Amino acid sequence: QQYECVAEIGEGAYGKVFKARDLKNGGRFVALKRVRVPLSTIREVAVLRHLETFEHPNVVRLFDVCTKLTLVFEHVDQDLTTYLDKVPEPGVPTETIKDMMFQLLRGLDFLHSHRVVHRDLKPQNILVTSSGQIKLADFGLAVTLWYRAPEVLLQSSYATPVDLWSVGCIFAEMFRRKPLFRGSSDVDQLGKILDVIGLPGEEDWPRDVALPRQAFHSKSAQPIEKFVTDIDELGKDLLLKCLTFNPAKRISAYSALSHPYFQ
Ligand SMILES: CC(C)n1c(C(C)(C)O)nc2c(F)cc(-c3nc(N[C@@H]4CCOC[C@H]4O)ncc3Cl)cc21
Numbered sequence: 001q002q003y004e005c006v007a008e009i010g011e012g013a014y015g016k017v018f019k020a021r022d023l024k025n026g027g028r029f030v031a032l033k034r035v036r037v038p039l040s041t042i043r044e045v046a047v048l049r050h051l052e053t054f055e056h057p058n059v060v061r062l063f064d065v066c067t068k069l070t071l072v073f074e075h076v077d078q079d080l081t082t083y084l085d086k087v088p089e090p091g092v093p094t095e096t097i098k099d100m101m102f103q104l105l106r107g108l109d110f111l112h113s114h115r116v117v118h119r120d121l122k123p124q125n126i127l128v129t130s131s132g133q134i135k136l137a138d139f140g141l142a143v144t145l146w147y148r149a150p151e152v153l154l155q156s157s158y159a160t161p162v163d164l165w166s167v168g169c170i171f172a173e174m175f176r177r178k179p180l181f182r183g184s185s186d187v188d189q190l191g192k193i194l195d196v197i198g199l200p201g202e203e204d205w206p207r208d209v210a211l212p213r214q215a216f217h218s219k220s221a222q223p224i225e226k227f228v229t230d231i232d233e234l235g236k237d238l239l240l241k242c243l244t245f246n247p248a249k250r251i252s253a254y255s256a257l258s259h260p261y262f263q
Contacts (some may be wrong), residue, residue, distance in 0.1 A: 003032055003072065012141075019075060022063070029075035030063060035141065037068040045069065048140045051114055058107030060127060060137040076135055080123035080170070084177050094232070096132070097174045102262055103134035104167060109253035112160045116140060119158065121166035122147045123173065145189040146179045151247050153190045156206035161247035164256065168242025171235075172228045180227060187211070194218035196227060200245040234261040 002024050009017040009031060020032040035041065045065055052062040064072035080100075084092070092100075104126060111118060118125075118139040125138035149165035151157040172180040181196070183189025190211070198221025205213040224236055224243075231239060238261045241251035251259070 003030065003070075005032065020072075022072070025063075031060075031073040031075050031137075033071040033073070035069040035071065040142065041069075044141055045071075047114070047116060051111070051116065051140070054110070056107060056110045058103045058134050058136060059110060060135045073137065076127035076129055076137070078128050080126040080128055083128045084123065084174070087177070091177055091230075092174055094230075097171075098262065099132070100128070100134050100174065101167075101171055102257070104136075104170070105253050105256045107134065107136040108163055108167065109257055111136070111139065112163070112253050117158070117160050118163045118166070121163050121170070123170060126170065145186060146182055148186075148189060149247065150190060150193060150245050151206060153186045154206055154209045154211055156209050157247055159247060160252070161250040164242050164250050164253060167253075167256070168239055171239050171242065172224075175228045175230050191216060191218065195222070196224070197221050197243055197245060204246040204249070232261070234259070237261070
């Protein structure tokens with residue numbers, strides 16, 4: 001074969017991910033994902049090959065697609081989790097947090113501009129290069145709810161704002177070095193969220209959903225500086241705009257890119 005598996009990276013629905021040697025390309029390490037067997041998946045791979053044409057700096061490269069289906073991607077040694085685990089005290093430098101957030105928002109804006117939603121953005125799929133470059137991986141194909149948006153938990157809407165909530169969760173975790181909302185179920189997750197952001201107005205609660213607003217009594221919203229201690233005034237504002245309950249009022253990746261926090 002042209003690829004030689006050396007280790008298992010992970011397991012997905014229904015497929016395994018393997019670290020492989022690209023024998024025809026200098027034995028470079030590659031991530032091989034096998035997708036089992038449709039037309040929707042054919043379209044999904046077509047979107048991924050199209051996004052590759054733009055070769056965005058903040059998205060993992062798709063080197064090859066073979067025919068059930070093998071997806072060959074560039075290998076990145078570490079994810080944001082392993083970076084946050086190994087970063088020395090007192091934590092990630094303020095300007096490293098800033099740069100990585102801009103790169104994440106750049107890759108996110110790229111995907112949203114091409115009508116692609118990640119839907120499972122988490123430090124495990126955010127890859128960090130030896131040069132410190134953020135690369136998005138593990139998206140475009142069809143459990144941890146710590147980054148799941150409230151409208152996904154409530155089962156009402158599944159648009160792009162879902163990823164911006166995950167970014168707000170990730171932004172907070174870059175300072176904390178531990179997840180912001182560590183729920184253990186959809187109802188626990190939403191409760192743990194509303195303890196911090198407060199119960200939203202009745203007009204901001206999704207209509208025709210199973211869980212009503214009155215199923216929670218989180219009462220008032222607490223200051224974020226308590227849960228994220230070293231955040232600046234501008235960072236606090238960007239973080240709040242991401243962690244907005246109502247997805248229509250939540251900042252977009254495009255307007256987050258222009259926030260004064262990045263000036
Ligand atoms: C693991 C997970 C995020 N993952 C999943 C599933 C479906 C399991 O969630 N599919 C994945 C996939 F298609 C590719 C990668 C990927 N991984 C690396 N490197 C890894 C990063 C983690 O540390 C070990 C390194 O070797 N480099 C490049 C890519 Cl693109 C990760 C995937």
